[PDB]
Amino acid sequence: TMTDPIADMLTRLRNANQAYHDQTSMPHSKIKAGIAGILKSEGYIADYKVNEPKEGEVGKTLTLTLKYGENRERSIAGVRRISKPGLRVYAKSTALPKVLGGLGIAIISTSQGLLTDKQAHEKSVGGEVLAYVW
Amino acid sequence: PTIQQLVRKGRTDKISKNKTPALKGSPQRRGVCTRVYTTTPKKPNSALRKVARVRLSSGIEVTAYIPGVGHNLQEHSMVLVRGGRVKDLPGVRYKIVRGSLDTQGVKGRKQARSRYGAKKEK
RNA sequence: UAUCAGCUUGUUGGUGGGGUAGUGGCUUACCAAGGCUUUGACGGGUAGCCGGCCUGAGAGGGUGACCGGCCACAUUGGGACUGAGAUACGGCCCAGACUCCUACGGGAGGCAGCAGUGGGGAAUAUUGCACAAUGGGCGGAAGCCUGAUGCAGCAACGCCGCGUGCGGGAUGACGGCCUUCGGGUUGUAAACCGCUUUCGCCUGUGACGAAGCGUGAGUGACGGUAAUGGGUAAAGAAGCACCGGCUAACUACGUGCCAGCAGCCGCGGUGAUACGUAGGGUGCGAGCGUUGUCCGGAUUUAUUGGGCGUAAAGGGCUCGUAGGUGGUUGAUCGCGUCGGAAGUGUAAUCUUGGGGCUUAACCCUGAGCGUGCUUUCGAUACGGGUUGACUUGAGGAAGGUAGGGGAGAAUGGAAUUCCUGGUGGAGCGGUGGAAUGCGCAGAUAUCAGGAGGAACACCAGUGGCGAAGGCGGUUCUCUGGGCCUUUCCUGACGCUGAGGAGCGAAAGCGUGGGGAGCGAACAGGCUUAGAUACCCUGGUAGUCCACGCUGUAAACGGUGGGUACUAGGUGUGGGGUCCAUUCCACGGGUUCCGUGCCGUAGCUAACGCUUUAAGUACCCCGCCUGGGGAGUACGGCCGCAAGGCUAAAACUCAAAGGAAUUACACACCGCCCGUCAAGUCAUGAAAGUUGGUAACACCCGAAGCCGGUGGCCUAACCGUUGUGGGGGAGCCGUCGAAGGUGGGACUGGUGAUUAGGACUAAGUCGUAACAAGGUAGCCGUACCGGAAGGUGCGGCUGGAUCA
RNA sequence: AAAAUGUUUU
Ligand SMILES: [Mg+2]
Ligand SMILES: [Mg+2]
Ligand SMILES: [Mg+2]
Ligand SMILES: [Mg+2]
Ligand SMILES: [Mg+2]
Ligand SMILES: [Mg+2]
Ligand SMILES: [Mg+2]
Ligand SMILES: [Mg+2]
Ligand SMILES: [Mg+2]
Ligand SMILES: [Mg+2]
Ligand SMILES: [Mg+2]
Ligand SMILES: [Mg+2]
Ligand SMILES: [Mg+2]
Ligand SMILES: [Mg+2]
Ligand SMILES: [Mg+2]
Ligand SMILES: [Mg+2]
Ligand SMILES: [Mg+2]
Ligand SMILES: [Mg+2]
Ligand SMILES: [Mg+2]
Ligand SMILES: [Mg+2]
Ligand SMILES: [Mg+2]
Ligand SMILES: [Mg+2]
Ligand SMILES: [Mg+2]
Ligand SMILES: [Mg+2]
Ligand SMILES: [Mg+2]
Ligand SMILES: [Mg+2]
Ligand SMILES: [Mg+2]
Ligand SMILES: [Mg+2]
Ligand SMILES: [Mg+2]
Ligand SMILES: [Mg+2]
Ligand SMILES: [Mg+2]
Ligand SMILES: [Mg+2]
Ligand SMILES: [Mg+2]
Ligand SMILES: [Mg+2]
Ligand SMILES: [Mg+2]
Ligand SMILES: [Mg+2]
Ligand SMILES: [Mg+2]
Ligand SMILES: [Mg+2]
Ligand SMILES: [Mg+2]
Ligand SMILES: [Mg+2]
Ligand SMILES: [Mg+2]
Ligand SMILES: [Mg+2]
Ligand SMILES: [Mg+2]
Ligand SMILES: [Mg+2]
Ligand SMILES: [Mg+2]
Ligand SMILES: [Mg+2]
Ligand SMILES: [Mg+2]
Ligand SMILES: [Mg+2]
Ligand SMILES: [Mg+2]
Ligand SMILES: [Mg+2]
Ligand SMILES: [Mg+2]
Ligand SMILES: [Mg+2]
Ligand SMILES: [Mg+2]
Ligand SMILES: [Mg+2]
Ligand SMILES: [Mg+2]
Ligand SMILES: [Mg+2]
């Protein structure tokens, strides 16, 4: 059964980006919506939208529309899940990870909401290292 | 393996085989020559490699090679035995230190003298 | 460490007393029956722990020398005494083992303090000086004591620094070595010229450490030391390893698979850059090598940071316990998590900033580090706890529905064999060819009738079902699971699952039954050098049934389960639903679940996989760590047995292996298997034999503390001044080291004999495998055989013919 | 239709 819906989101995004799909969809959760929002604010996806259920009439659907540049070029070089259900990863304000030498962003869930490493370091707050999207 | 599998049963290293058990944690050991003889090398190769069955002071008896052209040690000759394998000789894992105790340096050495216990000549 | 699974009876708790500095089964009496343990108790092995040290990018790995902190111990075992304080090192008591003295009655002793001796060992120092400094003990103090300490001796043991010369010098001298006899090289090297004097040697000066100590006088062990002036002579001062590749550096001579070298690859068989020497060179240098050990390289135990289709690796399959893990969301807690504050993390080390030794090593000093922990105050995104919702995961209801799913019972037909009868007569049968065999005592053949056992042609595969193993005549009875559906219900109830349990082809085993055909073993015939085989004729277990046992397979998709996502194309099985003509169905769609083939992205060493993943991801389980030895030995468990399960080590090799290219590549005159014979090495079994360790149950029981008793002995106290109180010797009791006795547990050596393993003649016997290896190979099992192997039964393709 | 084998050079 489903164990890590965040990892499911990440793998859905990775597979869709690899297959050059314009949009991907998944069941909605608050943390998924937050990660999608910070992905959009960091420019890794074109946009995102939460849709009220009208096909299954059961639950909200989170849909990410991706962006490909000139000559069909990926805007996401990769995404990786860090804090797995089997083994969870927490980083302090001083030991915050760097992704792609600082080019990519680690997504960290801090006590002040979802914050990209750069943000956390500015606020000197750590938390659970969710992802390494770059 | 999963993280839970590693937690339940961790990694275990290899055994790290020992090479010279008879020395018993010593760089070299004293022994007495219980037998002095020659052995044919394994194939390929062919000679009359000079070896000795030695009763080392650890109580273990092993076969030691005698390096260098020249040889004086015989029955009940006290020798110093160091590590060192002779590849084309099955069962020989030790060598006899020339120039120490009864065994003496190779006579006509002029190069690599220290490895054969040959004093410098004026 | 599970090849140690049960441990404990003052043991766990309670109440009263006692005891102690103090809590306490610490002790005692009584009461209760607890306590610990597969998250590993108990037992075995090893070990002082740490600050640190080495290594490493880090994470880690190894380690516990000096120095510093804690602990333990002081000849072995036990005991108390004194004291503020005791494992009481240089105390006492008892016992044991030792050494010494003795007049034989009895006494004395403990270097793991410093130095030193013997011994063991590959290996580690002087029977030194001083209390001048710092620290300690006693004294009011002067002071005394201090093998702490400060120093010196010894050792290249480590680290650091310095020297053995510097400039000039072509005529590129001789001499070695090489040569193409031209020369090249050693080589600016030398000769020769001019310089400098660190260290060493000779000689002079000469400290700091002492702002100490002492009333003063006086007072430095180190010590004529460091430092420093003068003098001498370029002098007193360079070795070791290496030069085939990795790896910096090559030639000649000698040797001739010899002598020898080697870390691996390998070198040496007459042109050796690999042996030995020489010249030349290279790396280092008061060192240089070798050996040992550790880390690295090794991502070669992969948390960082690996894998399991074929390379080593998915459990035979499922159920399920602990455990791990968890769809959406409200509220709340603030355990994880995160952020401050305080405390702590001694010093030294370490990193770093300053400073001192002529520099450095080293030393001092400031800071950091001390990766944590405790306390406290905050944050609430996530994990978790508590609590409430939601239905999409999951399960259920109702309806629809496919099927060799299973078990039981009855029963159908063909065919084989046998029996009876009719007919008929010379062969039949069998093969590459034959023969054994059967048959005029009428076989084979042919017809009729009957008996019996086993398997179910066609349907039938490109298919269905089952968790797997597997499942096919028909009928009935009993029963399991799957699939679909719009409504319906419950509301995360899910997933996986160590250990455990069950199921588990065939062979095999036990009891009974049955026995047609088939058919291990067996007998005979053929083939053959032989034929314990292939082939032929016979033929017993078995194959079958009932009930058990065994529990293994190439139990394979060589691919664990669950989930989500990521082109298609095209067959086929099952359930719906839609459409037109019907008002069937043919047809098309569409949806859900199977089952194949092709194929994109992607992945893979390649082959190949590719929505039924071997792709992208998350959760849980099993498993791998070079090839042999070996899935073997020992032990234990299971079994009636066969055996299965768990599962090593010594030793040995430098490969073993995967896929592919053109099991062989020395290229089929290839490769390669196993007995037997010989030698060598390691190991197992074994009547036994020889030790060791850890305890147990009893008997006896020293010292000693405690508890009694004390008629004997008693200066302080009190006396009615005849004594009493209190104490002490002695004595008894509990505990108690050692010893004795006995029966077990564990374990080492050894063992006639015996077993297999590894390696070596270039030995003997066959040819089992690799090609269709000449009978396709292999897996499990069974029996047989000199040996490979042969055969039966079931299975696999890691075989193929023919499509 | 069965039809075996191929020491040690340097
Ligand atoms: Mg009490
Ligand atoms: Mg010890
Ligand atoms: Mg340690
Ligand atoms: Mg110490
Ligand atoms: Mg006292
Ligand atoms: Mg004392
Ligand atoms: Mg003391
Ligand atoms: Mg003493
Ligand atoms: Mg001493
Ligand atoms: Mg000695
Ligand atoms: Mg003093
Ligand atoms: Mg004084
Ligand atoms: Mg004294
Ligand atoms: Mg080179
Ligand atoms: Mg030569
Ligand atoms: Mg490593
Ligand atoms: Mg290594
Ligand atoms: Mg690997
Ligand atoms: Mg896997
Ligand atoms: Mg394999
Ligand atoms: Mg399987
Ligand atoms: Mg099993
Ligand atoms: Mg559970
Ligand atoms: Mg959750
Ligand atoms: Mg909430
Ligand atoms: Mg410091
Ligand atoms: Mg300085
Ligand atoms: Mg410190
Ligand atoms: Mg919760
Ligand atoms: Mg139904
Ligand atoms: Mg039955
Ligand atoms: Mg058929
Ligand atoms: Mg098929
Ligand atoms: Mg409801
Ligand atoms: Mg079982
Ligand atoms: Mg059977
Ligand atoms: Mg039977
Ligand atoms: Mg029977
Ligand atoms: Mg036969
Ligand atoms: Mg099968
Ligand atoms: Mg397997
Ligand atoms: Mg499983
Ligand atoms: Mg899977
Ligand atoms: Mg399909
Ligand atoms: Mg793979
Ligand atoms: Mg076995
Ligand atoms: Mg034995
Ligand atoms: Mg007693
Ligand atoms: Mg008493
Ligand atoms: Mg009295
Ligand atoms: Mg007594
Ligand atoms: Mg005793
Ligand atoms: Mg024997
Ligand atoms: Mg053959
Ligand atoms: Mg064959
Ligand atoms: Mg046979």
Question: What CATH number does residue A29 fall under?
Answer: 3.30.1370.30
The interface residues of chain A toward chain B in range 56-95, judged by CB-CB distance below 8 A, are 86-87
Q: State how far residue A52 is from chain B, nearest Cα, in angstroms.
A: 38
- Work out whether strand A127-131 and strand B28-39 pair parallel, antiparallel, or are unpaired: unpaired
| Distance in angstroms between the alpha carbons of the first and the last residue of chain B | 68
Cβ-based neighbour number of residue B38 at 10 Å: 11
The strand pairing partners of B29, in sequence order, are B81
Could you tell me the end-to-end alpha-carbon distance of chain A, in angstroms, rounded to an integer?
A: 28
Alpha-carbon distance A87 to nearest alpha carbon in chain B (angstroms): 7
SS3 labels along chain A: CCCCHHHHHHHHHHHHHHCCCCEEEEECCHHHHHHHHHHHHHCCCCEEEEECCCCCCCCCEEEEECCEECCCEECCCCCCECCCCCCCCEECCCCCCCCHHHCCCCEEEECCEEEEHHHHHHHCCCEEEEECCC
- The nearest CA of chain B is from the CA of A8 a distance in Å of 19
Locus of tokens 């859905």:
A12
> What residue type is B10 in one-letter code?
G
Please give the structure tokens belonging to residue A21: 């799909």
- CA to C1' distance (Å), from B57 to C737: 39
Sign of CA dihedral B32, B38, B39, B45: positive
> Tokens for A36?
């999608």
Query: Cα angle at A8 between A65 and A123, to 5 degrees?
Result: 75
Residue-number span of the structural domain to which A14 is assigned: 5-74
- Experimental method, per PDB record: cryo-EM
Q: Is the peptide bond before B44 cis (omega within 30 degrees of 0)?
A: yes
Window B11-40, strand C contacts by Cβ < 7 Å: 11-21, 23, 25-31
Q: In chain B, count of helices (H) and strands (E)?
A: 1, 5
The most distant pair of C-alpha atoms in chain B lies apart, rounded to whole Å, by 72
Report CA(B99)–ligand 6 centroid distance (Å). Answer: 52
* Distance, CA of B91 to CA of A66 (rounded, Å): 70
| 3-state class (DSSP) for residue B82 | strand
Residue of chain A minimizing CA distance to B5: A86
Measured CA distances, A8 to A38, A81, B35, B105 (Å):
17, 10, 75, 76
* CA-angle at B59, arms to B57 and B65, nearest 5°: 70
Residue of B nearest to A88 (CA): B3
Widest pairwise Cα distance in chain A = 46
Token pair for residue B92?
């020989």
Resolution to 1 decimal place, in Å: 2.8
Altogether, the residues listed in chain A come to a count of: 134
Distance in Å, residue A90 CA to nucleotide C243 C1': 58
